[PDB]
Each structure stands twice: as structure tokens, then as C-alpha cells.
């Protein structure tokens, strides 16, 4: 009964050019057009869109578990 | 009609195994994590069996909810193409029927081999016999399960390698199918029968962008890969002859990557076949964990130093210009020149020319790989017997000692050894086998152990800061020929250490036979590591070593003299605060000849985490490579011919005690982790939340979480105390917690050693004292007695004292004074004969004041 | 015992004492006498 | 200074046994001049030594006057025990010391 | 180099075991090999009874310093 991601986190608004609230510093997983760079101040480059007409963005260097949290919540 | 329906059109020769249509609960293993509990334990779950005589093939039926029914039906319909999915069957209340599944899942096998208990190990026997690995009568040969004895258990286990390999291949096929089908989910061991098929898609999610989370699966399954030799079929051409690997090939990097892609395709973390490309020590451990598994396919002649012919003044030598580790991959030097004191020192220690200019050798006495003889005739060494002391024995018998039935009786003697004893002793290295470790669990345990070791500070130092003691000690094979460490330290050094950070310097060490009193006739050996290794290891580690050796009240008590009440202070410290205090100890069977390579590498890395400022990443990696090539897989000259040492601790280096302490603390921490995770969380709240977050940090997080590391460190320091000295530990653990399984019991240590060290710890060699008023039964070969002065005192075994007194080797009273000093605490023993022991020594010494021998136990 | 016999295989009175011992500390002086010679 | 002179003399006198001719070919056959140290004597050795525990092993390893090991052909030229031993003696096994040193040479 | 032997002899005569004493006195009949548990002696010996099977004389001629063999 190993669940993917219970109590999934919610939407958040960010500046651009899904959050994982960790008490040791906030970390944004995915920002749900092509936006190569996103800013929050810190810059977070984004991956090519994931069409499904909305689009989803992954930060390059993201493991296969976080993609589950991001895609599972969506 | 239900039995007919459950098997529609596929050889419905079934037999009921439950109770009619009712479900069938079983006590199996599982991996559970859903927002209330997290761990790897056993839980209580309509199984059928197919008759061929019966064969292991079952139709596991389930009852579920319509939501889960449809959720699984969609994904199964989308994944039926792959052959690595157990043929399912859906019909209706909803019933999902599997088909042709094995009796036990991979999770059960891994749990049985990771939580071994000879008292209750029926599942392991059933698994072994069911697949023709051995025969049921094999278990009437009691002591069969042990590894040190009956090494045929390795052959028995290796019969599951093909099944494990097929399971891995089918898992990779399943991952490819999911990824192409756009399904995201988490992959667990408990959802794969032993044949290789899969099932239980009840918590997945919905093309071309799917991603399965397969970290827990491989991390938990890793240990069973080197145990059952799953990758032994990769040495064949494609029941076929062995691959005729070119003798000159030494790269194998492409083969490593091909194996990784064949079996670990979806391990979403960078793998560097050469560990020199790693980013941090955690990455080094992660990559070495895979190199260990992948090094058991290539020919064993490829590994070892890599030599290149260089020229000096037109004189061509053959010297090493790299090395090929089984763990750190290929490593190429940087300061290498093909044309042209320290140069002589580095060159001579190199086994390149020594093995090149020596006669080939084929030793059929042992099984360890040989390299080359260094002479025309092998050498046989013998150990002389003791030296009876007539005077002391006559004096003792005059005082009415050694009477029939007396409690004190000689049991320690100098035993003599015949000619072919050194080689028989060396052949004990056959107990060191390849071992794959749970990488995520080890990566948490390394952080916890570093937190243990956080109280100390140190770093690299120069040649004018290192303190050298015992300058008269064996240097090394080429070096002992002309002197000892004193000569070399009196000649040169800083540049050599600097060079040591840019190259690899393999060395040779001699294995002699020691001459000491013991209660068993087994031969014992002392090894001298090459000077070119100790010289640099001291500069690397001495600051930290001395920091740990002069710290009081810590978890490791190395260097804490028991005189002047030190024992009392240590005992009070270990008894800091525990609700239900108890005591416990243990002994490691063949610690120096069985601890795997990964644990030693981890200990070395932990001992080097003080260099975040003094050294960069590359310097630390080359230091690790030097250490691994010099004291882990070194070359040993036992007698007159060279052998390759598969592994195990080097008993001559100065960092063996502290490395063993790190290894012991790691074993204790992993025992606690297994006990807490294996504890059924569903059965208090703080502990349950702590274990939930422990599982999250182990098999869900991908980076350090210092907050939980501190929390768990404090939790252990509070409810599970310990006092650690290399391969010798005492514990003071909350008894109620251990009874509930919230801390490390002794069976936990047994299982951890079984599945992570390839040895068996006898429960008769580990004790437990429940009455704190009488402290630990045995620690550092000492006993404790609560006397009035009320303090604890260290008193030894009278038999050992008498034996040491009777038989003294050649080449004075200081030995008797030391024996009396160690014998004074016996005076307060309730027994009268024990008390007489000290007086005998004092009377004998005068023949050659109790206040002097009492002053060494009053704390001032 | 095995040392007193095996060590002779490569190198008569001292056989009987070592095997027929009940307390131990007698034979452990026999082996030195043979080895010295 | 004494260690320095002794060290190099050991290096020089230990190079004359390297068999440069037989070693040069195997080194040059490498892709980049790097070969594992293990296979150096295995393919460029002019002598082999076989330590045997008893006669049962002798039957399966060194039977006859020629035995093949390392994918080559060797011919026995001397046998020793823990004193020379004649090949006719081995058969009578309890009368011989266990560690027999069956030296040999490479047959061209 | 006589201290060890004199100590050994004193210890032996202190042990006072007939089996050891028998063979010790005989030496002052000596065996040629290790006493088993077939024996060659230059029949009761070492407090044990031996059945004789074959005998030899000085010139290596069987007879119905001689040599005695027994099991
Ligand atoms: Mn399941
Ligand atoms: Zn790496
Ligand atoms: Zn450093």
C-alpha cells in the first residue's frame, strides 16, 4: 500500500519569464507557451511544455518521484 | 462454481487452499506507506493452487471497491502487451483474479533473507527446496545456515541467481511498458511473484510521459543480488563456454554501462563507471554500490594495478599508471612522465615490477587468487611453544593452588603451530564475499553516524605536526629488508603526501605469525602495512584520531583509561538516563575477515568529512582511492609468494580501531532502523510519527534532511545508549521499548549481521544483564564488580591472570606489577579463592603494599 | 598434541605423555624439548 | 643514504629478469600501452611453481612429464618436498611430505 | 644447555606414572617410530600388551641387537 503522494500540496502563483513547502527553504517543483526561465529572488529554468490547452513545466534536474507528485496532483 | 470461474480457459486443475469462497489470511511481508504508517514489516492479509502432484502456481483472488476495480482494470488493459505482467482476470461485488502466481513474492524472499531467525525460518527453507536449490534432507545437517561453517550454503543460495536475473529483466520490461504507456506510479517488491510477473496496480495514475518510482524496489532488493549471484550468467557467450575475454582488456566501461541499462535502466540518478566523476562522497557510495555488483562478471585478472612501460635513460621499466578497482572503477594517474628519493619510494612499493620479474605460481593449497612467486622455493613458518616458569608454578602450588576442583584452573597457553600454518590462516579470507548494500538506508546511516562523530574536529596537517609513536615497527615488504619505520621517518614527506592527492600508490604488506597467549589453538597473524601507506594515512587522519582519543563522555570511549575511577565514570555516562535500564553486548564473528568492502569504504568516507575546508573533492577522492588500493584490496606476501587480498580490515594500520568503531555504530544504527521500520506501526504517537518520517527520509527523500537527522540522533541518545570501542560494545537500552520493538534488540543484530556481513552471530556469545547494580558481564575482556569505597571496579578472569603468570616468553618484574594492578580489584570479589590471587602475586613480587595498587582506583 | 607429531614429520618418548594427559600443563613443556634438539 | 643505494640496486638487478623481448611484444600489443599487472607473469614467465597438498591433486594436475597450464605447455624438470624427489616415488604417498613443489618451464 | 633436560627429567619422575616409568626405565628396549594406539622395538610394554607377529635379527634374517614387531 505504498502510496504515491498523499496530502498533495496545492496551487501557488509565481513570476515567470506547484510548490513543495519545505521548512528548510521553499522549493517549487513545477509551474503549471514556452517559458525558458522563471524567477521567484532566484531563477529556476524550466523544461519544454508537457501538452495535455494548458501546459506544465518541470525544472531540469528533477527526479522521478517529484514528477509523480507533480503529475499525480494534476 | 467459484473455483470453476476463477480459472476460465487455462487448465483449471486447481485445488482449494482456503475455506470455500472465504478469503485466506496469511502472515506475509509487505512495504506499506500511506499517511499513517511507514516501514518494511509483516502484516496479516482467496488463494488457490494448481495440481500438475502439486506445483507452485496460485490464483490470488481479491475483493476490492468499484473505484479501485475500474482503476486497476484500465491500467491493466493498457499494460497487457508486456510479457512481464501476470495474466489478470476481472469479473464480479468486484473480484480481481490473478493467474499462475508463485506461492511467495519477492518481498517475502527479501524479508526472509534480511530478517533471518533460525528459530523461525520455515519460509526460507520452503523457498529453497521448492526451486531445487537443495534437498529437504539438507536441513537435518544442523549448522547448515552458518556461513563460516558449511560454506556450501553459498552454492545452495546461488541456485536462485537465474530467478533473480529473470525478475530483474522482467521488471525492466515492465518499466519500459509503463513509460511508453504513460502510467505514473510507485514500484514495490511485494507486487512481483518469484517468477517475475507483476500485479496490484491499485495506486497508479494515467501517453509517452509515464514515470515509475522504482527507488524503494531496487534499494531493498540490492542485498539479495550478491548473495544469490544473479549476474553469474553474464560471463557466458550469450550452457555455453565462458567468454574468452581478452587478457589485455581492462576498461569494461562500455560493458558496465550496458549492464546498467539492461538491469538498472530507470535508476534516475547519474551513474559514473569511474567514480572519479562523482560530485560528492554520497555519489561515490552510490556508484560503488553498483560497481560492486558489476565487478563480478569480468575476468579477475583485469583488476589490479595497470602497468605501462616507461623509459629512464633508455632503461625500460614496468610501473603502474592507474588502477582498476572493483568499486571505484578505473582510475588514471595525473603526474605521470614517460621520460626522465620519493621516486624510489613510490617505485619500489609498486607491485608492478615485483610481479613482472617473478616466477609464475599456482598455489593449490588455497583458493585465493595468486599472482607470482618471488623466489624458487616457498617458505614454511612455525610457532614455538610456550616457556614454562618453574619458579612461579612451584610458588603457587606451595600456596595451595590448582587443587582438584578448584575454581581457578589453567586455561590459557602458548600454542605451537606446524609448518603450513600461515597459509591455512591466510585462507580464512575466503569468508569475504561481494556484498551489495541497501544504498538509501546506508546513505541515511552514514549521516546519522557522522552526527555521532560531530563532536570531534580535525583535518590535514603537515610533517611537523604529526606525532609518531613506536618508531620501531615493521614497514613493508621491500622496506623491512633494510629497517623499520624509524629509518624511513628519520630520512625524509610533505611532497609525497601532496603527490598522494594526485595519484595512486599500490603497496605490498607481509603477513607474519604472532606469538601470544590465547585460550584457543587457532593461529593468529599480525600484518605490517607498507610505510608509503601509513606515512600518508597519519597525515590524513591523526588530528581526528587524537580528537576522538582525548574526548570524554562521548559514545566512543577509545583511550579512556580505566584507572582512577575511569570505569565508574564511563559506566555512569552510559547510564545517562533510561526509563527501564538494562545492558547488552555482542561479538562479531571474524570481524576482520568478513566485513564487506562497502562498509569499509563508508567508514573511510565518514572519517574524511572533516576536510570540507582543507581539501577539495578530487583530493579527497584520490585519498579514498589510495586507502582502498592500500588497505582493502592490497597485495599480501604470505610466505614467499604474492596473493591478492579480497578484502577485510588490515590489522596493522593505525585506523583499524576507529574504522571498526564506525562500522559497529553503523551496524547498531541500521539494527535500530530495521527494528523500528519492521515494527508494526499500527500497533503511542510520537514514535509512530518518527518512524513515518524515518521512512520518508530514507526511501522518499533524495537529499539530506538535517532536522530529522538531529531528531533521530537525540532519540537514540535518549532511549538507546551505547559505549563503543572497536569491535566491542556495551548498551544501556530502555527495556520496555525493546520489548515493544522500538529500539535494537539482539535478534536485530543477528539478522543485520546475517544479511549484511555474511557471517552468523551465535546467541551464546552475546550476553544481557538486567540488574544494573552488577554492570556489564564482559567488556574489553574485563568484568565489573560493585564494591564499597559504592563504585564499579574492573576485575579480569583469574584463569587468564594465572596463565599469563605461569607461561612467560623469553626476555622484568613490570609484568608482575601490571598483573597485580589489574588483579587488585579481585580482592573485593565475594569468592575467597579469587581474592587469594592478588595476594599470591604480592607475596611473589616481594620474593623478587596494597595501598599502591589501591590508589589506582580512587578517582582523583 | 598435533604439533609434537606433525612437527616431527618434517624435522619417541614424548608421544605417550602428551596424548595420555588429563591435566594439561605437562605436555606444553615436552614440545620445547624436542624443538630445541 | 644507505637505503637509497640499496633500493636502486634492487631495482636494477631485478630488471635483468624481465625478459624484455617477450615483454615488449605483449606490452606493444596493447591498445594504449596499459595492461593489467596480473597477466604479466601469466604470459611472460620462464618458470612455474606448483605447490600440491597430496597425491590426489598430483594425479589431476601434474600427471606425466608434461602438464598444460595457462593455455601453454610445461615440462617438469624438478620436484622438491619440505630434498629432491624422483617422479617414480610419487604413487607410497604416505611416505612423502605434503607440500610438493613441482617446478617447470615453458615449452616453445 | 642441560638445565631444560634436567628440569624435564625431574618433572617426569615427579609425575610418577607407571606407563611412562616403564618405557623410561627400558631406555636406560627402545622404539623406532611413534608408539601407536604396529610398533617396532629394538610382550608387555608401556603398561600394554602387544601380540607379536614378526621378528628380525641383526643381519635382517627372520627368526622363528634384534628387532621386534607387534600390533
Ligand atoms: Mn500488493
Ligand atoms: Zn558518482
Ligand atoms: Zn584534507
Residue numbers in the entry:
A (entry chain G): 1 to 17, 31 to 45, 49 to 56, 64 to 75, 85 to 106
B (entry chain A): 6 to 50, 54 to 60, 64 to 103, 111 to 224, 227 to 258, 262 to 363, 368 to 519, 524 to 714, ...
C (entry chain C): 7 to 17, 33 to 58
D (entry chain B): 81 to 162, 165 to 173, 176 to 192
E (entry chain D): 84 to 111, 114 to 122, 127 to 131, 147 to 168, 183 to 189
What does the report in the manuscript say about this coordinate set?
We determined a cryo-electron microscopy (cryo-EM) structure of the nsp7–nsp8–nsp9–nsp12 complex and observed a nsp9 monomer bound in the NiRAN active site. The native N terminus of nsp9 occupies a similar position to previously reported structures using a non-native N terminus of nsp9. Our cryo-EM analysis was hindered by the preferred orientation of the complex and sample heterogeneity, yielding final maps with high levels of anisotropy, with distal portions of nsp9 missing and weak density for the N-lobe of the NiRAN domain. The first four residues of nsp9 extend into the NiRAN active site, forming electrostatic and hydrophobic contacts in and around a groove near the kinase-like active site. Asn1 of nsp9 is positioned inside the active site, primed for transfer of 5′-pppRNA onto its N terminus. Although the terminal NH2 group of nsp9 is the substrate for RNAylation, the local quality of the structures is not high enough to distinguish its exact position. Asn2 of nsp9 is in a negatively charged cleft around the NiRAN active site, and contacts Arg733, which extends from the polymerase domain and positions the N terminus of nsp9. Leu4 and the C-terminal helix of nsp9 form hydrophobic interactions with a β-sheet (β9–β8–β10) in the N-lobe of the NiRAN domain. The N-terminal cap of the nsp9 C-terminal helix also forms electrostatic interactions with a negatively charged pocket on the surface of the NiRAN domain. Interestingly, the NiRAN domain lacks the catalytic Asp, (PKA, Asp166); however, like in SelO, Asp208 is next to the metal-binding Asn209 (PKA, Asn171) and may act as a catalytic base to activate the NH2 group on the N terminus of nsp9.
